Amino acid sequence: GLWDPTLPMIPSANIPGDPIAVVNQVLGISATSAQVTANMGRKFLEQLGILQPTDTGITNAPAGSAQGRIPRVYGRQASEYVIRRGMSQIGVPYSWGGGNAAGPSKGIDSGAGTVGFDCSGLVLYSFAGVGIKLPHYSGSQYNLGRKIPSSQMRRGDVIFYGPNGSQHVTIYLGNGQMLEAPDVGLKVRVAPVRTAGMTPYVVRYIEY
């Protein structure tokens, strides 16, 4: 019983570091997920009227802290933007290892010929819109942000599965539903929350 038995009972794709996210061969440019995330974070802060010269655009709280860069009075707005970004991807194919801060991408290993999202890729893409920078591995995502008891999960919190949160990750939508990139052959979808294999905590990246 350690895993969600509806999905492969293995750790999810683990893509190191700060991958290239944008490649433009005509202009001859490229940029990484962290670059795109910082750019989008600064834009978001500017739209709230709070951009400062010291802001890189990266908005993550120190892991475990209840205080991040985005003010609490703007956190619902931030969270709703993240959710809209993710939900806009419903119907995009799953691809093992797929996705970056810019959108779906070619995957790895099995997913090498498929442009799409995997579980952690969808989560990282969604949160990047407000400057929340996440690693492309569900177990590493579980170690960031602030833990909330699973029984108190709230819309916008992030649900994890398997040992160390390593099997699967999804975005809770409230009302017993979650947004996920599920498995090969499928598409990004809204699905009922599953409790089998779930970690006893969810993760909150945005306070409100």
Side-chain angles (χ1 to χ4, degrees):
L2 197 65
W3 308 91
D4 178 350
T6 72
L7 300 176
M9 294 176 115
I10 66 175
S12 64
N14 182 4
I15 301 104
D18 180 29
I20 291 283
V22 175
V23 180
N24 185 323
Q25 292 98 318
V26 170
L27 287 166
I29 62 170
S30 53
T32 65
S33 281
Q35 286 178 97
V36 165
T37 300
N39 297 345
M40 292 186 308
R42 288 188 318 281
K43 184 139 271 40
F44 184 67
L45 297 170
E46 178 180 61
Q47 290 185 315
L48 298 175
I50 70 182
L51 185 65
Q52 298 183 273
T54 50
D55 285 317
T56 60
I58 304 305
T59 58
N60 299 247
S65 179
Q67 289 87 38
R69 175 62 184 94
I70 299 164
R72 292 171 70 90
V73 290
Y74 301 129
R76 287 183 185 271
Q77 180 185 336
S79 176
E80 292 296 333
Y81 181 40
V82 168
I83 293 167
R84 174 167 358 274
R85 287 168 63 84
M87 281 173 344
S88 77
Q89 306 299 296
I90 287 166
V92 172
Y94 181 91
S95 178
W96 176 270
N100 58 44
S105 73
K106 173 193 142 134
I108 70 177
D109 284 354
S110 227
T114 304
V115 170
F117 286 108
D118 68 3
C119 50
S120 56
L122 178 64
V123 172
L124 90 76
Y125 163 75
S126 300
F127 279 91
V130 301
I132 293 288
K133 186 176 75 179
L134 299 173
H136 196 157
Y137 173 45
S138 68
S140 294
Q141 294 178 347
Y142 191 59
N143 294 337
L144 300 175
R146 189 170 68 91
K147 296 315 197 299
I148 300 294
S150 289
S151 63
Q152 294 297 128
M153 63 169 65
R154 185 179 71 181
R155 176 173 172 90
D157 294 346
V158 180
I159 302 166
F160 294 78
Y161 298 83
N164 292 130
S166 69
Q167 187 191 15
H168 190 57
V169 60
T170 76
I171 304 175
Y172 187 43
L173 302 168
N175 293 318
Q177 300 195 305
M178 63 190 191
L179 178 73
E180 64 178 349
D183 199 1
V184 197
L186 304 169
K187 305 179 150 72
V188 172
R189 68 185 187 182
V190 175
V193 168
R194 299 181 301 273
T195 62
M198 238 203 50
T199 58
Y201 296 92
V202 300
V203 175
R204 185 165 301 160
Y205 296 116
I206 301 167
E207 302 288 342
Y208 65 74

